[PDB]
Amino acid sequence: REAICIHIGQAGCQVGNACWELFCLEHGIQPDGAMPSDKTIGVEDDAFNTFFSETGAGKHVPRAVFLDLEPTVVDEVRTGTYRQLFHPEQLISGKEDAANNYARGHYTIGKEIVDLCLDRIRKLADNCTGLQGFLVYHAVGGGTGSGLGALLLERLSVDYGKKSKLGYTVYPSPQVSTAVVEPYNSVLSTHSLLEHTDVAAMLDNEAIYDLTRRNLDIERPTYTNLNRLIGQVVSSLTASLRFDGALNVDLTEFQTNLVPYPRIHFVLTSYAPVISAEKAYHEQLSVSEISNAVFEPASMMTKCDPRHGKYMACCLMYRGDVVPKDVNAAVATIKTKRTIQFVDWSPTGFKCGINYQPPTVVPGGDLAKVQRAVCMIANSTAIAEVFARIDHKFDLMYSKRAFVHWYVGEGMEEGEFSEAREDLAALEKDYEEVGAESADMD
Amino acid sequence: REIVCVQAGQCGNQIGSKFWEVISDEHGVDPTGTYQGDSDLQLERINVYFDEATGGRYVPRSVLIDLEPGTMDSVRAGPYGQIFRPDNFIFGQSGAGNNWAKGHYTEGAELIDSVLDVCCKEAESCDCLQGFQICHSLGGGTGSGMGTLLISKLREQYPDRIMMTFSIIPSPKVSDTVVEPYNTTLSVHQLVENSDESMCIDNEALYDICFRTLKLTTPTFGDLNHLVSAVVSGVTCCLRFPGQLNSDLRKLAVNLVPFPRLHFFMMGFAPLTSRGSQQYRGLSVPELTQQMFDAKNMMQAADPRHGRYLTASALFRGRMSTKEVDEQMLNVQNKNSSYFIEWIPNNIKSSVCDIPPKGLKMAVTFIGNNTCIQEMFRRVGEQFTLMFRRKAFLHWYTGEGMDEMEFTEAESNMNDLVSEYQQYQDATIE
Amino acid sequence: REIVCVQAGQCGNQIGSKFWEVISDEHGVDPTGTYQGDSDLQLERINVYFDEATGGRYVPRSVLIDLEPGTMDSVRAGPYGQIFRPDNFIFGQSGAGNNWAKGHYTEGAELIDSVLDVCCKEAESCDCLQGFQICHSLGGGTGSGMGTLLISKLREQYPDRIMMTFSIIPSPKVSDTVVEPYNTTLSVHQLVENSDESMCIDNEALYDICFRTLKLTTPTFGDLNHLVSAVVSGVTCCLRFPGQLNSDLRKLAVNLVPFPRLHFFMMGFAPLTSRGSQQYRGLSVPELTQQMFDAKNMMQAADPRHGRYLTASALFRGRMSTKEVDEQMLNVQNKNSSYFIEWIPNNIKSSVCDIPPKGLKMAVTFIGNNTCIQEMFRRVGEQFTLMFRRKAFLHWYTGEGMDEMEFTEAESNMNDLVSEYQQYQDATIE
Amino acid sequence: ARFEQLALAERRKEEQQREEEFFAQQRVEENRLANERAQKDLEEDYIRK
Amino acid sequence: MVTPEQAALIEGAFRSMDRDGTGLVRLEDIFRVFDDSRHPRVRDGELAPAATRDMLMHQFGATAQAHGGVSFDVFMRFHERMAEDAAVAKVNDKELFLTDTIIGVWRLGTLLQPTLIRPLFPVNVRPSGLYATQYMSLVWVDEVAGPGSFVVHVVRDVVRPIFSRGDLPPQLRGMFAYPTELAGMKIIEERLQIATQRWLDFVWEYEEGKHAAVPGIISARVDPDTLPQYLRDMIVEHDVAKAIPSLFFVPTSVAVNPMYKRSSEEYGYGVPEEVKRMSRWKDLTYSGQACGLIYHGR
Numbered sequence A: 001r002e003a004i005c006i007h008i009g010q011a012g013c014q015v016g017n018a019c020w021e022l023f024c025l026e027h028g029i030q031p032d033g034a035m036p037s038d039k040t041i042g043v044e045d046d047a048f049n050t051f052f053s054e055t056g057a058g059k060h061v062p063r064a065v066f067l068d069l070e071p072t073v074v075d076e077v078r079t080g081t082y083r084q085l086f087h088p089e090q091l092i093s094g095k096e097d098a099a100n101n102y103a104r105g106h107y108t109i110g111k112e113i114v115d116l117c118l119d120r121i122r123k124l125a126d127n128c129t130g131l132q133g134f135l136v137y138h139a140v141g142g143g144t145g146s147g148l149g150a151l152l153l154e155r156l157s158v159d160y161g162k163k164s165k166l167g168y169t170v171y172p173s174p175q176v177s178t179a180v181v182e183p184y185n186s187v188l189s190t191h192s193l194l195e196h197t198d199v200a201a202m203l204d205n206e207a208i209y210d211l212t213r214r215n216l217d218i219e220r221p222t223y224t225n226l227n228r229l230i231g232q233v234v235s236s237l238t239a240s241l242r243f244d245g246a247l248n249v250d251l252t253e254f255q256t257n258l259v260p261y262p263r264i265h266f267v268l269t270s271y272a273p274v275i276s277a278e279k280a281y282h283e284q285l286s287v288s289e290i291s292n293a294v295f296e297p298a299s300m301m302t303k304c305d306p307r308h309g310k311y312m313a314c315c316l317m318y319r320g321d322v323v324p325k326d327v328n329a330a331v332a333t334i335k336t337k338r339t340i341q342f343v344d345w346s347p348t349g350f351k352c353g354i355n356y357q358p359p360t361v362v363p364g365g366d367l368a369k370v371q372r373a374v375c376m377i378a379n380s381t382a383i384a385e386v387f388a389r390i391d392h393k394f395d396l397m398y399s400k401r402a403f404v405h406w407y408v409g410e411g412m413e414e415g416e417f418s419e420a421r422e423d424l425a426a427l428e429k430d431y432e433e434v435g436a437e438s439a440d441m442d
Numbered sequence B, C: 001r002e003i004v005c006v007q008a009g010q011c012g013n014q015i016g017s018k019f020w021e022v023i024s025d026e027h028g029v030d031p032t033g034t035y036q037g038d039s040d041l042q043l044e045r046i047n048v049y050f051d052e053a054t055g056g057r058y059v060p061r062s063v064l065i066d067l068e069p070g071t072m073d074s075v076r077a078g079p080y081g082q083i084f085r086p087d088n089f090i091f092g093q094s095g096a097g098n099n100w101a102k103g104h105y106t107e108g109a110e111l112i113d114s115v116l117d118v119c120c121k122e123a124e125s126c127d128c129l130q131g132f133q134i135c136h137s138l139g140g141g142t143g144s145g146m147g148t149l150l151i152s153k154l155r156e157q158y159p160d161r162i163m164m165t166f167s168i169i170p171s172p173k174v175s176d177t178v179v180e181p182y183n184t185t186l187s188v189h190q191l192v193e194n195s196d197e198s199m200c201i202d203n204e205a206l207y208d209i210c211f212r213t214l215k216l217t218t219p220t221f222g223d224l225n226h227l228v229s230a231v232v233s234g235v236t237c238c239l240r241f242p243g244q245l246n247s248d249l250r251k252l253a254v255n256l257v258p259f260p261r262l263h264f265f266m267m268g269f270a271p272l273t274s275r276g277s278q279q280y281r282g283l284s285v286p287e288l289t290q291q292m293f294d295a296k297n298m299m300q301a302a303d304p305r306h307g308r309y310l311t312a313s314a315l316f317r318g319r320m321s322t323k324e325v326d327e328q329m330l331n332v333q334n335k336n337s338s339y340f341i342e343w344i345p346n347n348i349k350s351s352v353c354d355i356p357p358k359g360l361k362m363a364v365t366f367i368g369n370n371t372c373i374q375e376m377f378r379r380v381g382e383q384f385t386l387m388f389r390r391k392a393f394l395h396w397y398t399g400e401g402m403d404e405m406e407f408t409e410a411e412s413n414m415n416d417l418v419s420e421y422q423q424y425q426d427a428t429i430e
Numbered sequence D: 001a002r003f004e005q006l007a008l009a010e011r012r013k014e015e016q017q018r019e020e021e022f023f024a025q026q027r028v029e030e031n032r033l034a035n036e037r038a039q040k041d042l043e044e045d046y047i048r049k
Numbered sequence E: 001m002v003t004p005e006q007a008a009l010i011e012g013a014f015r016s017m018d019r020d021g022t023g024l025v026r027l028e029d030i031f032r033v034f035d036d037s038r039h040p041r042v043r044d045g046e047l048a049p050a051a052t053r054d055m056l057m058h059q060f061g062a063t064a065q066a067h068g069g070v071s072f073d074v075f076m077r078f079h080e081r082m083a084e085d086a087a088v089a090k091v092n093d094k095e096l097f098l099t100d101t102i103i104g105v106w107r108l109g110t111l112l113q114p115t116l117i118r119p120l121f122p123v124n125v126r127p128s129g130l131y132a133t134q135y136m137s138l139v140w141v142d143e144v145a146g147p148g149s150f151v152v153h154v155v156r157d158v159v160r161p162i163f164s165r166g167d168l169p170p171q172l173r174g175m176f177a178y179p180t181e182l183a184g185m186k187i188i189e190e191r192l193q194i195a196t197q198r199w200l201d202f203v204w205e206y207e208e209g210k211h212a213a214v215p216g217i218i219s220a221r222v223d224p225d226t227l228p229q230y231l232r233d234m235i236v237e238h239d240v241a242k243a244i245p246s247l248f249f250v251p252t253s254v255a256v257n258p259m260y261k262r263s264s265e266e267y268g269y270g271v272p273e274e275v276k277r278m279s280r281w282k283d284l285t286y287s288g289q290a291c292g293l294i295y296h297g298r
């Protein structure tokens, strides 16, 4: 039933604001933690339990921690509108940043802050009776997100063991960039993330900018739009735990159905009825139209074209007024298409889910109100193209040791760069080998 | 995260007075020291530059040092002079004589213990110390010699903190003093070991900014010191206000310097608009980016078109889209690709801050690490060698006690700095 | 689809001032720059010529260039002069001396970089750039030399856009200057290489228009510049308003020029009629076509009856039937069949636009490609050869640095242009 | 419900229009300040003469 | 030439400027009334304000020292020269330029009754965008030099613009002025006193026993000893003002300042209305009688 969210660094805290705004408005908890209800009977509504626990006075409080090394963003959360919702202990802040250095987060500064984080996670886990995973939001381009995210995932993986850890990760875009040292941090992050995560969802800001320009009519988008879209995706994936439906899907079913081999746990995400209010009155939104939408490359939230690879598994989440016969007819029609190909060892390529609760509309939001939506996460060999361009940029910088003196001075051996680069090279070879048709090797 | 300022010599104290006027205005501090601001956002980070006196008062974290009290009496007589703590004014009893050796060896060792005592007293009061900020000229006498002495002592005492310097260097044409090459060469020698990051400004470039861009009929040193105070207060803006993509002096240093000797940077500030053409152009991100890279708006005599950019940084203030920033920096790098060093895939860092300077809708400050800086040092070295061969004024310095071997060492070190810049300047795809 | 205007020299600045008055009136822009119009159709294409400055205002996308500021100060003093952006005025400190070589080699190369910088800054601001529009005289000094220099540079930098020119050329009858043939010959040599389409006007033709058609007793240059501004604003009118059969500068060029050297055109504008006569004749399509083809109304000294039409174009403004246009163009082609080149089956393109110029129900502008334009160049070449054999004033040009070989090249190129037109005239075949 | 969504969008449009008017006023104010500075300089020169 | 309305304006200026019934005006009145701050060249910033006095002397003194003053005809032909010089001006329009330059230079029109300050916008109109945030100044007339000498005492930035000056009585409208309206008249500055950021109330009377007030417009840093007796009588602390029987409060509105607002404030926008509607929807679904979109909890 319940899940605990850990937000690290700047992207993770700002995405957390959008997520908790959506979860509050969807369940109906007031910004001060209240929950008005005028009927004295019919209070048996446990759905909040997945994200909130109630105190003996009836206040609701959310199952989240906010972790950052600079104070400004969490102090902005402390003085904002949701001041009374969070317990002040949950908003954790250090004194100084990791200065875009993975080495400062991992070796020098995160070792001091990590034990407080583990004590907080323990304090959450003691107020639980059926934890079935952690949701983690972070970007691998920055210093504290990379270093402390790796250190915290390692400690969580030793202490809690088999419990699932699901990551939503913002990778450095292939040509949009914000800092020079992004390749080193992204390679070193990916090395740790390979061993210590159960499912990793990949996002690229360049794709969400393209989607917001083409489908929505926004000329000058800003991070609040992207974060609201991400919150909607997470709400769609966790809706299967919280509301009634025809075919429910527990979070363990995603990992069992989408991951064929233990290293192949990186998934693509897309969302279908991204449409504006003015467009919404011009179109019907049947099951087959939105099912066709999640497979168009114009719908992807990562800059990769799945037509350059083969699908291994697809998980289709339908929410709203949908009938199973229409889902079956849509999936059979998609299967007929010639630009969609599955590896010959995966005959039953699809998993379906159907939930009755339609997606919520947020007062300041930019999405239209729609009666049904579908969200897709899929595992495909095309992602190998995403790693190769990062590897080329890392090789370009590392050939002249362009910035290594900061990392070696702050405490890391130069050997660690070569180890991580060879391990990610082996991951690229794994994705090359797994995609070879068995009919060719006889 | 608090910065301590040091102001040295006449130029440093004069620039400092305007800087503390600008900062006190931006945070709404009256010259009596009383808070008069109009939003809580002003108060909540006042600690960064001010210390708290008992019930209301604010004191500016600055040490004023000079060898003749004329300047300190002028700043104390100024409109904001009262704000400064009296014990923070350090002065001697005889002048530097425009001589580096006097400032370094004779009056320097006499005063230096009292400045370190004051800076440590000021430093140890902070709960966590961020870098120091120092303003001085390299062409003067007490500024160059005692400033670099103090910098060396602070680097011994605080090697884990940040050291940041703003430095004025003599134009080859506006000669106010005959012995400028000696003071400049010895100061650059001190700076390349001691400093973490040093910014260089030509007074000739500020005159060309004023005359061509602002078309001022009768500029004064108040205008030049206002331009400098504008850039100085802009670099720290992300330290002390919220924003969508925070940045920090240490993050700038980590992203700008590929190798530890290459730490000298150019400065510019974009939204300078002429006195009679303001109704004709609205502020926008294309306008700021186009003005920001125009060499008319750069504060050194060397022009970027004769060199190549290793790295650059832009700090934006105001409510603006990240999409416009990222796509502008990509388009500028792609369209002018020959002027960007090719073994780095993206040379520009961006940062965005919510709170603009008062009375402007938007502003950007630009920091650039460009090899054309070698032209300033080469010019200073030519002028130094021409005089030294014949011993033009050397007896003053030798009479103070310097060995002649110091001049050849300092010349060799500056020549090696020029060579290091020159190799990266002229590389090509081969 | 944005147009950039350039106005060069005295003639260019005066014609530009009257043109921007007529265009600002047609779109209802106040001389303060505020939009005060009364239909959305006016607002919806303002972008074509204006950029939007903050809080309402519009600024006209034009660069003004001249070598002595007397004219520039006169245009700034005019009734609409304030609308122009101050930074768009480029001027030197000493005159062209009415000498082509000075304007091309000495003051040209000195000033041109600031003009190219302004033109690039202005061009790159458009979201999609349509062709350039160029106004200049060939008889002057800075107009001919620096105008053709700038045209050559713009053709190097933007070879895929359109380059369009309106050009004033001297007369054998009412010259203001003795050395006109040199400046004209060298400018026509430069133009025939650089331009995509060029329209030529004789001041003698504007005097005959003013005196004969409008019956003005004492015409002034304001009337001549009004006639020119009327045709100039008419050629682009279909670009910027709706219509039943849209047209564009590129479509005109593609339909008028059979071969790339044959790009010099004659102009006329039809609803010209005196205030006394206007009560006697209503507007209709036969009346406009009859006035439009009357050689009395054409802006060159050469007469069409001495040549042949290769191609022609007519742009109609107003709410009108397509039937009257097609049958009139057929009837005129059939009845006068000896004056149309026989290997093209239909020589006239038509276009129709809904919105007429203010206070006229309908209007047409005519562009014609006729071989009788060769007579003007031959006449100028005659006067040049008469002057050149005796080295009449050559020491000025040779003293600037020109080789005499340029003069023989320019003469040969102009003579070949005249020969090519004469060959295509070839009355009859065999 | 999408009707009410459109209404809220219209309200936001009006708010940003008000902000634009504010910024235009600020630009005019800064021009006035520069003019005042020039006035003071000319006064001092005249007094000298 | 001059239009008849301009002639009427000139006649009004002459008559209002003329003391006694004699048709002569002293040169001191010419000097005192003339406004240099509205001189076109000075406003554009290309002429020094002291140069206007020399021009006035050059045009007027020759007849002023001879006939003891200036008649109407000399004044009218002075304005005829004014129009002749404005004919060749750089401005796009000529009639409006002459009209408003006459109005500006000769200080005619409508002025706030105390201290004679020219308003920027109509007093009955609520403050616009920028002026709703810029602080105003507290000003009162001096007494050692009589009213009409245009000398005032000024305290800077002590009044919020949250109210509208049209609601005040006509004899107190001029007590508060914007910084841009102080140009063109002598000012004497006063010193503040050390205090915290508190906001203080302004009260007055319109009838015996009846009082009216405006809440929280004066900063607590106004030093009461420097002000005259009456002015510090009208300023009183808030709860003491509240305790006064039969008091009316002028409506005040606070406007946001677009210079000091963050990006994260965009998140919690319009949420209480949506959450109220959601709570109503969920309780309606729980009670039954819902046939369309229904809540699907547990």
Ligand SMILES: Nc1nc2c(ncn2[C@@H]2O[C@H](COP(=O)(O)OP(=O)(O)OP(=O)(O)O)[C@@H](O)[C@H]2O)c(=O)[nH]1
Pocket: A008, A009, A010, A011, A012, A014, A015, A069, A070, A097, A098, A099, A100, A101, A139, A141, A142, A143, A144, A145, A170, A171, A172, A173, A178, A205, A223, A224, A226, A227, B244
């Ligand atoms: N979607 C989204 N991406 C963001 C946001 N803020 C930053 N990013 C991206 O995340 C990367 C930068 O990571 P940061 O979160 O700033 O790094 P950090 O966690 O602050 O680490 P430090 O800089 O050491 O404090 C870049 O790729 C940015 O484009 C945001 O608000 N939304």
Ligand SMILES: Nc1nc2c(ncn2[C@@H]2O[C@H](COP(=O)(O)OP(=O)(O)O)[C@@H](O)[C@H]2O)c(=O)[nH]1
Pocket: B008, B009, B010, B011, B012, B014, B015, B096, B137, B139, B140, B141, B142, B143, B144, B168, B170, B176, B203, B221, B224, B225
């Ligand atoms: N930009 C600027 N330059 C200054 C200022 N004061 C002095 N200078 C320059 O600095 C040099 C003189 O150095 P100075 O400060 O007097 O050295 P000091 O005697 O050791 O303090 C000359 O080039 C002056 O032009 C100032 O206020 N601003």
Ligand SMILES: Nc1nc2c(ncn2[C@@H]2O[C@H](COP(=O)(O)OP(=O)(O)O)[C@@H](O)[C@H]2O)c(=O)[nH]1
Pocket: C008, C009, C010, C011, C012, C014, C015, C096, C137, C139, C140, C141, C142, C143, C144, C168, C170, C175, C176, C203, C206, C221, C224, C225
């Ligand atoms: N049609 C027309 N011709 C002009 C105008 N002004 C000057 N000219 C002619 O252009 C020639 C003079 O060239 P000018 O413009 O002075 O050359 P510049 O000195 O380089 O600008 C003479 O033949 C003038 O008669 C004008 O406004 N209209």
Ligand SMILES: [Mg+2]
Pocket: A010, A070, A097, A142, B246
């Ligand atoms: Mg960070």
